[PDB]
């Protein structure tokens, strides 16, 4: 996407989770932002000694190398439940005789 | 928890926030020197104060990580830039005094001149000018006349400015825990935390005196073949047994002998390899000269080249309006934006500068996987030593012939090798000798062991003790000759290019092991041969993330540098010279003066 979600000047719309207490399970999602406390210094949502802002920003330019352009990713998740199958693949018709 | 624990916490988030601001610092400061417009110099002096003002500012609790309570390597060699806290450290008046400083000394360094005595109305500037006269020109007089009046009128000038520039840069060095500003730069050498690889910093004195002693050898048959070329010139003013004039070294500040090589030349009958006529039948431009330089990497077994690489580099320079620097200069930006701002003529150095300015960027490539602070080269001697590795496989008459510039019916023997060789013994010869006194000369001064009044006459008897050279004009405590120098006036080291031709050899002859190629040094060929680059990415990707003497370690299996690749390198010359040498004396001698009779 370096042609499209890229710009000069950077780009900040997309962001990650660098700190985390912990490791998240799968397919867990987690939007907190409560500030990643290091040490035993308390934080408490407060920015100072041990306490940063976990969330950060992707520097995205099209200058950018190939390893670190951005790139869209799209997965699929195929979960298959106990209630009857929805989604199924392509069915193509051929002629009638 | 643990201060290595919070330190990493702390130093992960920098590595994303200093990446994003020197990459911008770096980005504005290459569309300046690339492109001349009044956009790109505040951008390039605003994201440079941002950035350098960035680590000042997480510097307060980046100090608060030691180093003893940390067990992990990479923590405390990212901390250890970041514990320096730069102009924090000195007080406010000796750290704005020191920008001054260096400011000044830049100043009078690029808008210094000299003027002609024959003509008034003429007065060359520096760069190039004063440069360019003191290279061409064979005269005795014409020398002397820029070369005496630019230290009154700059080198008198500087004495006060590099009075400062002794004491501001102690005073800091001595709040960094270190001996004097000559150990800040032993320092970049340094290494702590590892048992066995551990580098003392009082170490490097001998380290560097302990080859100089055997560089001598090569350098007293050269030496004393150049003075014997030059005593037919001037039988008044040099002896046989005596010091070569400082005004005919060849250069302003007697760096580089390359220019002598036309009196020096070993065989008038015989050819020397030059691919500068060469490329003109070939027909190959700027933009096929990074081409087949890419060819040779993915030969030897280095990574290739990306497309963003070969695309917007900066191959000449468009008129005045958008000015680019001609002077051969590969920055490093970041997020692998890498790219290179040299002038692109047809020559044989510019496919040896190609090599070169592209070696920084294939050392640029393969430590980008590391973290930001671990982004680097282990020292200041690896950056431009890199580089030359590449360019001295590349003048082999195997791959020249491969790619096509090198005619097949090309003779490669004993009398085509020493001419070329000596041609570039003057380049890598000459610099080392005059490096190691300079570097030398300031480890002293620094430290105070040199008074200010015998500034100059410990200089100029260490350059006859050195380099066997003699002051045509008695210069006294005034002058500064180390002043001048574009190292010592923008606080760069000037030392790398003596670690640099220890390093580079040393690269070269572990790689021909695996190369399979014996002998001297200058008949390897790495081309076609892929454990070449195999074994040197493994080193090129640590960077000072592991200890300079361990990435050393892993190729030629040695912690420090050594001459021995330096020697069978020249071999075919050192022996050539040792013949002619039989009816001269070996050596110098310091008791010899042009104005002494």
């Known amino acids: ?59 995205f330019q099209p200058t950018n190398g190939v390893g670190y352009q951005p790139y869209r990713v799209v997965v699929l998740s195929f979960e298959l439940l106990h209630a009857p199958a929805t989604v199924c693949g392509p069915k193509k018709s051929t002629n009638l005789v | 928890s643990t201060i290595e624990e919070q330190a990493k916490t702390f130093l992960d988030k920098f590595n994303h926030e200093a990446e994003d601001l020197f990459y911008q610092s770096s980005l504005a400061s290459w569309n300046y020197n690339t492109n001349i417009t009044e956009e790109n110099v505040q951008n390039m002096n605003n994201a440079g104060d941002k950035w350098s003002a960035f680590l000042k500012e997480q510097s307060t609790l980046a100090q608060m990580y030691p180093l003893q309570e940390i067990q992990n390597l990479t923590v405390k060699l990212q901390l250890q830039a970041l514990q320096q806290n730069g102009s924090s450290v000195l007080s406010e008046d000796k750290s704005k005094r020191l920008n001054t400083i260096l400011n000044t000394m830049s100043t009078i360094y690029s808008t210094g001149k000299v003027c002609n005595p024959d003509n008034p109305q ?92 055997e560089i001598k050898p090569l350098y007293e048959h050269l030496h004393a073949y150049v003075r014997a070329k030059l005593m037919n010139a001037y039988p008044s003013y040099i002896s046989p047994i005596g010091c070569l004039p400082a005004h005919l070294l060849g250069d302003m500040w007697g760096r580089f002998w390359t220019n002598l090589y036309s009196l020096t030349v070993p065989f008038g009958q015989k050819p020397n390899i030059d691919v500068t006529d060469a490329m003109v039948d070939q027909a190959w431009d700027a933009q096929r000269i990074f081409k087949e330089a890419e060819k040779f990497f993915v030969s030897v077994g280095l990574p290739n080249m990306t497309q963003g690489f070969w695309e917007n580099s900066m191959l000449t320079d468009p008129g005045n309006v958008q000015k680019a620097v ?17 002038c692109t003529k047809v020559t044989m150095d510019d496919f040896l500068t190609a090599h070169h300015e592209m070696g920084h960027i294939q050392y640029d490539m393969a430590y980008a996987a590391q973290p930001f602070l671990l982004r680097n080269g282990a020292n200041e001697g690896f950056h431009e030593a890199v580089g030359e590795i590449m360019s001295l496989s590349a003048a082999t008459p195997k791959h020249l012939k491969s790619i096509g510039l090198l005619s097949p019916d090309f003779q490669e023997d004993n009398e085509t090798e020493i001419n070329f060789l000596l041609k570039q013994a003057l380049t890598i010869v000459g610099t080392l000798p005059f490096t190691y006194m300079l570097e030398k000369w300031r480890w002293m001064v620094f430290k105070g062991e040199i008074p200010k009044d015998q500034w100059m006459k410990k200089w100029w008897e260490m350059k006859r003790e050195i380099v066997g050279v003699v002051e045509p004009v008695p210069h006294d405590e005034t002058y500064c000759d180390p002043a001048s120098l574009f190292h010592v006036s923008n606080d760069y080291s000037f030392i790398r290019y003596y670690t640099r031709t220890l390093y580079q050899f040393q690269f070269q002859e572990a790689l021909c092991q695996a190369a399979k190629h014996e002998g001297p040094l200058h008949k390897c060929d790495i081309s076609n041969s892929t454990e070449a680059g195999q074994k040197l990415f493994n080193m090129l990707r640590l960077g000072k993330s592991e200890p300079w003497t361990l990435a050393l370690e892993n190729v030629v299996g040695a912690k420090n ?21 039989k009816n001269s004396f070996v050596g110098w001698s310091t008791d010899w003066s042009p104005y002494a009779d």
């Open chain 2, 122 to 213: 003429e007065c060359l500037l520096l760069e190039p000018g004063l440069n360019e006269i003191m290279a061409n020109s064979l005269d005795y007089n014409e020398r002397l006349w820029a070369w005496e009046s630019w230290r009154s009128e700059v080198g008198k000038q500087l004495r006060p400015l590099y009075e400062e520039y002794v004491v501001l840069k102690n005073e800091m060095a001595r709040a960094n825990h270190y001996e004097d500003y000559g150990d800040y730069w032993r320092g970049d050498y340094e290494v702590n935390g590892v048992d066995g690889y551990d580098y003392s910093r009082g170490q490097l004195i001998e380290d560097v005196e302990h080859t100089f002693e």
């Open chain 2, 561 to 581: 540098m050594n001459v021995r690749p330096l020697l069978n390198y020249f071999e075919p010359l050192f022996t050539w010279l040792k013949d002619q040498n």
């Open chain 1, 1 to 59: 996407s370096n042609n499209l979600d890229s710009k000069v000047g950077g780009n900040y719309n997309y962001l990650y989770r660098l700190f985390r207490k912990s490791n998240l399970k799968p397919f867990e999602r987690d939007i907190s932002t409560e500030i990643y406390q290091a040490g035993s210094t308390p934080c408490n949502g407060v920015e100072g000694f041990n306490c940063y802002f976990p969330l950060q920003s992707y520097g």
């Open chain 2, 326 to 342: 001609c002077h051969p200069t590969a920055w490093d930006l970041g997020k692998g934006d890498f790219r290179i701002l040299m």
